[PDB]
Amino acid sequence: EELPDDLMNFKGTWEVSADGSSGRFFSKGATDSYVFHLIPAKDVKKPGWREHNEVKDSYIKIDKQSIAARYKTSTTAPYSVAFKVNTKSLIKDHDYKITFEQGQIASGITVDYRIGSAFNKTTDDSFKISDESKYASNVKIEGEEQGFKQREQGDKTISFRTLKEGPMSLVLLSKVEKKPQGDLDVEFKNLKIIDVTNPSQLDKGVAYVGNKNVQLTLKSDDGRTNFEGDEISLFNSRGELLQTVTVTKDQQNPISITLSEDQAKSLKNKEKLKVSIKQKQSKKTSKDFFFEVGIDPKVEAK
Ligand code: NA
């Protein structure tokens, strides 16, 4: 069976220019606004805990599978550290499922999970938590709420729909409300994201005997309007494949399928043609749809 591709872009590095690097940010006073969390320039590729440049209030650590923050006793609270773990380029108006493990959460740390813009691979990148609604709709954490809270440790699932095309990020936020009395660590690991978009459905099909042009009107029960990536297969009543087409970005109804001259000539009056739609990214396949070939209702000629 065909599995959807993992669309994470997490190579386990702070090296800003490196492909798959992750963003690192902070917010003094734990406000809506975050700026880039600088670390000593000579140490950006070094494994282990990396100090917040000069101030050393927070340390951060990344490796092939995990990303973590440490709050020191010198932290001025409230204070928040956030990471951005980038995805590959996403399709506009597709549905995605992020999974990861919430590792250790020290006593005193509260956590939030958001969707955001991708980390833009600059040391002056910035973001606002409240920018989430510019990039994603319908964000849902299974069994939990967004906003800073204490959370159970274990597997997490977050689903959302994109509002734009392009890479995005999972934003992993944590904060302390009071000054730490010892090192407080929080870890996140084993990040994955897959496309879970449902394929569109056939609303209506128009085909006439001897006519090469087939017009298929698509619909979506769950409100999708960008049918990009759906693979439409059209078959005759004998189950023989006639044509396959892939829907392009924001392609409007009706979707045209052009038959060969022999195929058009072979269509029978009232023939039940079959349509099967495969979502190429999520790998989900629709139910079989059927429609009849008709007689062109165009005006008679004499
Ligand atoms: Na929700």
d(CA 190, CA 141): 17
* HEC readout, the chain: CCCCCCCECCCCCCCCCCCCCCEEEEEECCCCEEEECCCCHHHCCCCCCEECCCCCCEEEEECCCEEEEEECCCCCCCEEEEEEEEECCECCCCEEEEEEEEEEECCCEEEEEEEEECCCCCCCCEEEHHHHHHHEEEEEECCECCCCECCCCEEEEEEEEECCCECEEEEEEEEECCCCCCCEEEEEEEEEEEECCCCCEEEEEECECCCCEEEEEEECCCCCCCCCCEEEEEECCCCCEEEEEECCCCCCCCEEEECCHHHHHHCCCCCEEEEEEEECCCCCECCCEEEECECCCCCCCC
**Distance in Å, CA 137 to ligand 1 centroid:** 10
Residue 27 tokens, joined: 């917010």
Give the Å distance between the CA of 269 and the centre of ligand 1.
50
**Two structure tokens written together for 48:** 């282990």
Rounded to the nearest angstrom, the distance between the alpha carbon of 144 and the centre of ligand 1 is 8
What CATH number did the domain enclosing 242 receive? 2.60.40.3580
Please tell me the experimental approach by which this structure was elucidated.
X-ray
245 C-alpha to center of ligand 1: Å? 35
Contact predicate 82/171, CB 8 Å: yes
53 and 181 both lie in a single domain: yes
Instruction: Give resolution in angstroms.
Output: 1.6
From CA 268, how far away is CA 295, in angstroms rounded? 10
Query: Angle at Cα 286 formed by Cα 285 and Cα 291, nearest 5°?
Result: 140
Query: Are 274 and 203 within one domain?
Result: yes
Beta-bridge partners for 53: none
* Strand-pair partners of 99: 157, 192
Distance 29 CA to ligand 1 centre (A): 25
Q: How far is the CA of 49 from the centre of ligand 1 (A)?
A: 33
Question: Do 109 and 233 have their domain in common?
Answer: no
Query: Side-chain half-sphere of 2: how many Cα atoms within 13 Å?
Result: 11
Ligand 1 midpoint to CA 115 (Å): 12
Same domain for 234 and 160, yes or no, is no
**185 shares its domain with 229:** no
**What distance lies between CA 253 and its chain's CA centroid?**
25
Which of 197, 213, 230 is the last residue in one of the domains? 197
What the block records as the tokens of 258 is 């052009």
Query: Are 63 and 84 in the same domain?
Result: yes
Query: For the domain that residue 1 is a member of, what is the CATH number?
Result: 2.60.120.1240
Centroid of ligand 1 to alpha carbon of 159 (angstroms): 9
How many structural domains are present in the chain? 2
239: left (phi over 0), alpha (psi -120 to 50) or beta: left
Which residues surround the ion ligand 1 when the cut-off is CB under 5 Å?
A: 140
Task: Please state the φ and ψ torsions of residue 289, each to the nearest 5 degrees.
Answer: -110, 150
Q: Residue 301: which residues within 8 A CB-CB, separation 6 or more? A: none
Q: Containing domain of residue 258, as a range?
A: 198-302
* CA 140 – ligand 1 centroid, Å: 4
Q: Which candidate, 172, 198, 192, places its Cα nearest to that of 69?
A: 172
Residue 181, classified by CB atoms within 10 Å of its CB into exposed (0-12), middle (13-18) or buried (19+), is: exposed
In the chain, the amino acid numbered 291 is F
Burial of 114 (0-12, 13-18, 19+ CB in 10 A): buried
How far does residue 141's CA lie from ligand 1's centre (Å)? 6
Distance CA 60, CA 85 (A): 14
Is the peptide bond prior to 78 cis by the omega test (within 30 degrees of 0)? yes
Give distance in angstroms: CA of 21 to centre of ligand 1: 28
Question: Do 99 and 163 lie in a common domain?
Answer: yes
Smallest CA-to-CA distance from 36 within 114, 125, 116, 115 is with: 125
Task: Kindly give the distance from the C-alpha atom of residue 203 to the centroid of ligand 1, in angstroms, as a whole number.
Answer: 30
Is residue 10 located within the same domain as residue 91? yes
- Is the same domain home to 47 and 146? yes
Instruction: Give the whole-angstrom CA distance, residue 58 versus residue 71.
Output: 5
Both 83 and 160 in one domain: the answer is yes
Residues 82 and 217 in one domain: no
